Amino acid sequence: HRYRPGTVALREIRRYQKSTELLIRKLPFQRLVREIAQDFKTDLRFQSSAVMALQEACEAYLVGLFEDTNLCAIHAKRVTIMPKDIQLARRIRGER
């Protein structure tokens, strides 16, 4: 037998809501942070604590935004999140 569409999705929801680890691969995020930082000032070093603080912040922010986006989607009587939902959510949030 084979899984109906949208079952492994809820398995992943239970699994990752019960989980407590970082969900973005460490080194791509690290160079993302470094590349972004090079715009504001060049020739920068980072203590590892700093990039990991930035990753904890980033991921926390993104999961909260994703819950709000899911609420917008459900409010439109849907189950699929779409940029309509993200833009509506961070517009009520006042995030310009």
Partner: protein
């Protein structure tokens, strides 16, 4: 291997983040959209952070610059240098 790293944020990673937020079905044009929002969120915090380390006349961004930046922009973070 330092340019275009916003693409390095894989679709599975974003997918996981979204699953933690409780979403069941995810449209495809979100994978770019979310990248964008992240790019800007991060763009703000580092900017604040960098000015802090630029004011202390150092060259390493310290964890305190990040946590101060996050507070400054209304998102207090517990667990890194108090």
């Amino acid at each position: 291997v330092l340019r275009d790293n916003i693409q390095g944020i894989t679709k599975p990673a974003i997918r996981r983040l979204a699953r933690r937020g409780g979403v069941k079905r995810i449209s495809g044009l979100i994978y770019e959209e979310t990248r964008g929002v992240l790019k800007v969120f991060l763009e703000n915090v580092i900017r604040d952070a960098v000015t802090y380390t630029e004011h202390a006349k150092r060259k390493t961004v310290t964890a305190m610059d990040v946590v101060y930046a996050l507070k400054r922009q209304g998102r207090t973070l517990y667990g890194f240098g108090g």
